[PDB]
Nucleic acid binder design. Structure first.
Ligand SMILES: [K+]
Ligand SMILES: [K+]
Ligand SMILES: [K+]
Ligand SMILES: [Mg+2]
Ligand SMILES: [Mg+2]
Length: 136
RNA sequence: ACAU
DNA sequence: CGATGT
């Protein structure tokens, strides 16, 4: 089982969990940063990992790319498969922004199609995903 | 347990 | 050490 180097890798970064959430997507081979989301003041790790995959799907579809997406998040991969983000984060004025983005990402999944393979990055074999923030 |  | 999730 080898890395598919022609791929997009995504990852979340946070200050606290729940806390400030951001994410980015990079070229798996070169590490070139392809997109970065502006920090969201309160969210969870798994909400951010979900948003990152969905953004990757939208980014690749816009560019007519058949590349797969790597994520290290078992949870977010399943949420994308199900088209449903099963977060426990409370809904209040401070979490409204992240919940709006998650709701909108789900809505995009339910109104669009894609063949993009969403693959588990095997951290135990390969080390940290190329999109990692280096904060742990 | 596993993945973050 | 704590949190988010299956
Ligand atoms: K990190
Ligand atoms: K990891
Ligand atoms: K746990
Ligand atoms: Mg991750
Ligand atoms: Mg990471």
């Amino acid at each position: 089982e080898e890395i598919i180097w022609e791929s997009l890798s995504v990852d979340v970064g946070s200050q606290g969990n729940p806390g400030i959430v951001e994410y980015k997507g990079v070229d798996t081979k070169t590490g070139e940063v392809l997109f970065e989301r502006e920090p969201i003041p309160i969210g969870t790790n798994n909400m951010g990992e979900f948003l990152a995959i969905v953004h990757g799907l939208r980014y690749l579809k816009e560019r007519n790319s058949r590349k797969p997406i790597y994520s290290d998040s078992q949870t977010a991969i399943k949420w994308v498969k199900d088209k449903k983000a099963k977060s426990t984060l409370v809904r209040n004025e401070e979490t409204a922004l992240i919940w709006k983005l998650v709701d909108e990402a789900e809505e995009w999944l339910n109104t669009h199609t894609y063949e993009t393979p969403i693959l588990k990055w095997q951290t135990d074999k390969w080390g940290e995903i190329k999109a990692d923030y280096g904060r742990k």
